[PDB]
Paper text:
We recently determined the crystal structure of the N-terminal half of [name] and identified three evolutionarily conserved surface-exposed regions: R1, R2 and R3. Our results indicate that the conserved R2 region in the [name] inner tegument protein rectifies this motion to produce sustained retrograde bias.
We previously mutated three evolutionary conserved surface regions of the [name] tegument protein (R1, R2, R3) in [name]. Each mutated region consisted of five alanine substitutions. Although plaques produced by the R2 mutant were smaller than wild type, all three mutants propagated to wild-type titers. To determine if the stark R2 mutant phenotype resulted from misfolding of the mutant [name] protein, the crystal structure of the [name] N-terminus was solved and overlaid with the previous WT structure. The five point mutations did not affect the overall fold of the N-terminal half of [name] as judged by the alignment of the wild-type and R2 mutant crystal structures (rmsd = 0.55 Å). These findings demonstrated that introduction of the mutations did not contort the [name] backbone, and encouraged us to further examine the R2 mutant in cell culture infection models to identify the specific source of its avirulence. Firstly, the [name] R2 mutant failed to spread to the TG following inoculation into the anterior chamber of the eye, which was consistent with the HSV-1 R2 mutant defect in vivo, and pinpointed R2 as a conserved effector of alpha-herpesvirus neuroinvasion. Taken together, the in vivo studies recapitulated the results obtained with primary cultured sensory neurons: R2 is required for retrograde axonal transport but is dispensable for anterograde axonal transport.
Author numbering: -1 to 477
């Protein structure tokens, strides 16, 4: 514990010698001990009083940097459990900026207005917590999205939390963990909103709409039953032309696959949440021959995933959707091209398996389906993490590093150059963190040191090269 150690140290007295206290401060300046909000709150008043007292009984430069920027130095390594939300951080800030902090620093001849001082930190972390609370006010459950399928660009996910006003907070651990938390709680809803929009799209055919309904039930509701989803599926299913089913008594009429069993059990019962058949229960399966495409909409043929995966009988047209996926320059673009075309997360997984089983001798039309599904499965892995922070940089790097071992052997067969898959994923999902903020925080902390040096009549101080080496290590170790 950095604050804890600092308190023990400065408590040893010996304040009548400047360098003994000047070393105990330089240690903390570079210590690694992470803090907790309750732990800072419980130690703040004493730690700040010590700092203030170390500077009143030494006058040295490092004591004054420590006291003036103790607020930001202590926040920088704070580890917060974001399930508790902002209130523990506001409560902390309340202690940091209380009247005893201003009296302690004022009475010591120091400032309250350093960039990482109690005034700047209280004002800025308060605005940030306010932005955080606002970013979490969205849809709490899938039922909310189904009622209001608002489409949120993931490019906007947590963006108010990394605006320039908060540049000097950006490298703090609790900020980076909060971006991660916000991403985790917002991005999942976009594929659901896009699917709900198709299911409710009155310019699509009933079979198309009925299948989108079933993908929604399976990806986002499992066994939790939504009455609107039930109502939507039954209305579309009841209007599906009976010409789309294999008639009873034909060879291979029975549903052949886990997918076909699930689609058939729902249609037969008019119930999205029926997924099995009673052994002996007669269920018509959907045709998977090229003719059944006439019952689908041209742009979303893959939403009938059993037909699109029946490659020896049927070739779905995925050239248009591959054109849009391959030209996508943002998360919103690529996810919207994927989901509206029927390349949900599960369909990407199934169509990737069905096409790569034909490798290396693919036709151009199959390669279009396989590129869409392959890129698609990477996008769906990345989407829930997409954000402007270091966590998404970590998550993207881990996913990108798996692409060559997964697909190095089949990219030529798909018509892609070497690293073709990484090329497309980078173009629409590459991390876009405002890394300039790292430099802004370092500049700010070092300006405060500069002021301390000049105040102490120094062209250079020990505090500078120590804080420098701490910040310099974090910028390389993290970013
Ligand atoms: Ca945490
Ligand atoms: Ca907790
Ligand atoms: Ca927790
Ligand atoms: Ca709790
Ligand atoms: Ca077949
Ligand atoms: Ca066959
Ligand atoms: Ca075109
Ligand atoms: Ca997979
Ligand atoms: Ca095989
Ligand atoms: Ca993770
Ligand atoms: Cl988290
Ligand atoms: Cl098959
Ligand atoms: Cl096949
Ligand atoms: Na603003
Ligand atoms: Na590696």
């Amino acid at each position: 514990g950095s604050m804890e150690a600092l308190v023990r140290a400065l408590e040893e007295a010996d304040h009548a010698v400047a360098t003994v206290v000047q070393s105990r401060i330089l240690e903390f300046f570079m210590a690694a001990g992470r803090e907790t909000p309750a732990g800072v709150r419980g130690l703040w008043a004493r730690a700040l009083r010590l700092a203030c007292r170390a500077y009143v009984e030494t006058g040295t430069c490092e004591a004054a940097v420590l006291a003036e920027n103790l607020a930001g130095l202590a926040l920088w390594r704070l580890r917060h459990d974001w399930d508790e939300g902002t209130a523990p951080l506001l409560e902390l800030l309340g202690v940091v900026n209380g009247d005893d902090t201003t009296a302690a620093l004022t009475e010591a001849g120091l400032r309250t207005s350093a960039e990482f001082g109690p005034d700047a930190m209280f004002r800025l972390v308060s605005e940030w917590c306010a932005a955080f609370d606002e970013a979490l006010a969205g849809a709490r459950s899938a039922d909310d999205v189904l009622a209001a399928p608002r489409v949120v660009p993931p490019e906007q996910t947590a963006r108010a939390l990394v605006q320039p006003r908060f540049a000097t907070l950006y490298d703090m651990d609790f900020v980076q963990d909060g971006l991660r938390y916000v991403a985790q709680h917002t991005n999942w809803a976009l594929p659901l909103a896009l699917a709900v929009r198709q299911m409710q799209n009155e310019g699509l055919k009933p079979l198309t709409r009925a299948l989108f309904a079933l993908t929604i039930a399976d990806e986002f509701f499992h066994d939790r039953q939504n009455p609107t989803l039930r109502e939507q599926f039954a209305e579309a299913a009841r209007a599906v032309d009976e010409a789309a089913l294999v008639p009873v008594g034909e060879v291979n009429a029975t549903p052949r696959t886990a997918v076909e069993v699930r689609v058939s059990a729902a249609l037969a019962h008019g119930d999205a949440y029926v997924r099995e058949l009673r052994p002996g229960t007669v269920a018509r399966r959907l045709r998977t021959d090229q003719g059944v495409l006439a019952l689908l909409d041209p742009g979303a043929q893959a939403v009938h995933v059993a037909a699109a995966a029946d490659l020896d009988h049927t070739q779905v047209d995925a050239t248009g959707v591959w054109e849009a996926v391959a030209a996508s320059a943002s998360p919103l673009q690529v996810v919207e091209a994927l989901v509206t075309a029927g390349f949900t997360r599960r369909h990407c997984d199934l169509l990737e398996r069905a096409v790569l089983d034909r490798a290396p001798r693919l036709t151009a039309a199959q390669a279009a389906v396989g590129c869409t599904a392959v890129v698609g499965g990477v996008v769906h892995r990345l989407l829930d993490d997409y954000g402007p922070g270091l966590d998404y940089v970590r998550a993207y790097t881990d996913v990108a590093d798996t692409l060559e071992p997964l697909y190095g052997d089949v990219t030529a067969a798909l018509g892609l150059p070497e690293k073709g898959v990484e090329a497309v994923v980078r173009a629409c999902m590459a991390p876009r963190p405002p890394t300039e903020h790292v430099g802004a925080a370092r500049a700010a902390l070092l300006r405060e040191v500069a002021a301390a040096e000049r105040r102490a009549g120094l062209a250079h101080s020990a505090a500078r090269e120590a804080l420098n080496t701490w910040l310099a290590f974090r910028a390389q170790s993290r970013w």
